[PDB]
Write a protein that binds this ligand. Structure first.
Ligand SMILES: [Ca+2]
Ligand SMILES: [Ca+2]
Ligand SMILES: [Cl-]
Ligand code: NA
Lengths: 28, 171
């Protein structure tokens, strides 16, 4: 089973989600 | 970790967070970064912890430089929270406008195919690729060739924000 969002790699949404998750880790 | 009320209110207003959420994000941010300034090594440390056997160097650098709005080499809380607001809570158009800033690596207003490949390759370098038959290999190049061609409606070798924002949107 592929990671749900990596179908969106190259469309912008994958980078956005990974970016968001890094910031969330930086604040927890 | 006490944020001045005027700053809390301004960062509230500028984001999708409530005042309580802004203060909670600040407490956690200052807990992890006691000076209030996150540097590039600490930003990559976060991604290496996610993907300890990928190489997050490239992705972390590209995203860090976009997050560092004033290009002083540090992510300050104002940058942290406005970046988190758009990437986590933005509308689809706002999230894609943010992604356009990331992909447009030379800031000339267009995404070229080499730039789309640099981001996609950065992603696969960090998180990996789906194991496939050698004849159907999941190479960033062939994925980018497909998507780039689909979005370049006028086939001029370059993508505008408008061409990009319409990429997964249905008509
Ligand atoms: Ca900065
Ligand atoms: Ca460009
Ligand atoms: Cl993406
Ligand atoms: Na075009």
């Amino acid at each position: 089973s592929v990671p749900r969002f990596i179908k969106y790699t190259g469309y912008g949404n994958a980078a956005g989600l990974l970016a968001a998750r890094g910031l969330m880790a930086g604040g927890r | 970790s006490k944020l001045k009320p005027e700053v809390v209110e301004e960062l509230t207003r500028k984001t999708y967070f409530t005042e309580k959420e802004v203060q909670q994000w600040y407490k956690g941010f200052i807990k992890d970064c006691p000076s209030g300034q996150l540097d590039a090594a600490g930003f990559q440390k976060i991604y290496k912890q996610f993907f300890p056997f990928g190489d997050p160097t490239k992705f972390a650098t590209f995203v860090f430089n976009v997050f560092d709005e004033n290009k002083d080499g540090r992510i300050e809380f104002s940058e942290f929270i406005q970046a988190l607001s758009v990437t986590s809570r933005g509308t689809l158009d706002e999230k894609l406008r943010w992604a356009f800033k990331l992909y447009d690596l030379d800031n000339d207003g267009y995404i070229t195919r080499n730039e789309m490949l640099d981001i996609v390759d950065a992603i696969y370098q960090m998180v990996g690729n789906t194991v496939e038959l050698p004849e159907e290999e999941n190479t960033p190049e062939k994925r980018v060739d497909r998507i780039f061609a689909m979005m370049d409606k006028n086939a001029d070798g370059k993508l505008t924000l408008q061409e990009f924002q319409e990429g997964s949107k249905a008509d």
